[PDB]
Symmetry: C3
Subunit: 106 residues, 3 copies
């Protein structure tokens, strides 16, 4: 998928998690987010398309999705145990990682 | 290890999972599969030896193993919970990631 | 963080795990080790400074931290279900991964 499609997936499912009632809804949304994070790692963002593909900034961009995926998995661990409120709070804290990348490459 | 050696490991241990009768067999097979997938990330496939190491195709190839590893971990979660049948069903779904990479790059 | 700071975070928190008494101490040390491992993926070791960031040595180096992060997570899985001693044993086994990278790129 496109980078923008994957960002829409991440943004939409974060809102699904915010409004969720039960753990299975949160689990499903976090799974879509993880798939979107890994697919986005394949993209070249507009900010960097004029730099070398081997540039340190492209590596910095890709590793950011490794960090996002691992943090999503931590929230998913809480959702699998049925801890809805804790999973929702951990999902909310993802936004620190979203924003950290946006400050550099948005 | 060799790219083909890592593929033999993935394939041998998928066959173990297909036939397994308990969660211990599955969990040990998935652990080997994850190690082979991560090690395969370090290789250049023959069909991409004519690409730069950070070309979009080589990124697609390497991230394909991150996707495989996360999907293996999903199956391993299920096996650690005694969901042997569900873990085996997750192993079957894994094959679409195997196939998609082979279609592009084998 | 720079690579040296990430390495001190790995070293320090491995020492906490060896000395820990309960699962909360082990879980929190493993979480910091994982964050440091992923942040280290973004760095260039001094022996590879003059190489392309996408050279095979640099890919080998970055995948080394994928393997370490996944091995850290296995230890966290053991600690999260309260198997403290098995988590401590697993954390001790990580050193073979630390040492393997060191022998090549330190
Ligand atoms: C880098 C490692 C990023 C992480 C982590 C996240 N995002 Fe992102 N985002 C990134 C870039 C380079 C861009 C610009 C390219 C583009 O798609 O526009 C974006 C953009 C968005 C957008 C707008 C998408 C669009 O319709 O154009 C959204 C809504 C967005 N990003 C949301 C988002 C969320 C919720 C994240 C964390 C869960 C997140 N992003 C992480 C780079 C990176
Ligand atoms: C890319 C991201 C791949 C994924 C995911 C999987 N495989 Fe693979 N495989 C890939 C390539 C580029 C090649 C060709 C290597 C070569 O030197 O020709 C292969 C090959 C195989 C083989 C045949 C090995 C041989 O001796 O020629 C097998 C049996 C195989 N792959 C199995 C396999 C399985 C079971 C996978 C998922 C569980 C899987 N592969 C994923 C690239 C990629
Ligand atoms: C590569 C994939 C590595 C893995 C895995 C681990 N380390 Fe590492 N380490 C690496 C390099 C290239 C270096 C040299 C850094 C430099 O700038 O010179 C290091 C260094 C250390 C150090 C010493 C730090 C210093 O004195 O500046 C320590 C204490 C250390 N590393 C610890 C450590 C541990 C405990 C690891 C596994 C849990 C580990 N490292 C993994 C590369 C890699
Ligand atoms: Cl997950
Ligand atoms: Cl990577
Ligand atoms: Cl696993
Ligand atoms: Cl890369
Ligand atoms: Cl972890
Ligand atoms: Co897990």
């Amino acid at each position: 998928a496109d980078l923008e499609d994957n960002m829409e997936t991440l943004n939409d499912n974060l809102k699904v998690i915010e409004k969720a009632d039960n753990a299975a809804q949160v689990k499903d949304a976090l799974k879509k987010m993880r798939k979107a994070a890994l697919d986005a790692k394949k993209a070249t963002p507009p900010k960097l398309e004029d730099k070398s593909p081997a540039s340190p900034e492209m590596i910095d961009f890709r590793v950011g999705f490794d960090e996002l995926a691992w943090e999503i998995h931590d929230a998913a661990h809480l959702a699998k145990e049925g801890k809805v409120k804790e999973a929702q709070a951990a999902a909310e804290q993802l936004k620190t990682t979203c924003n950290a990348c946006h400050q550099k490459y948005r």
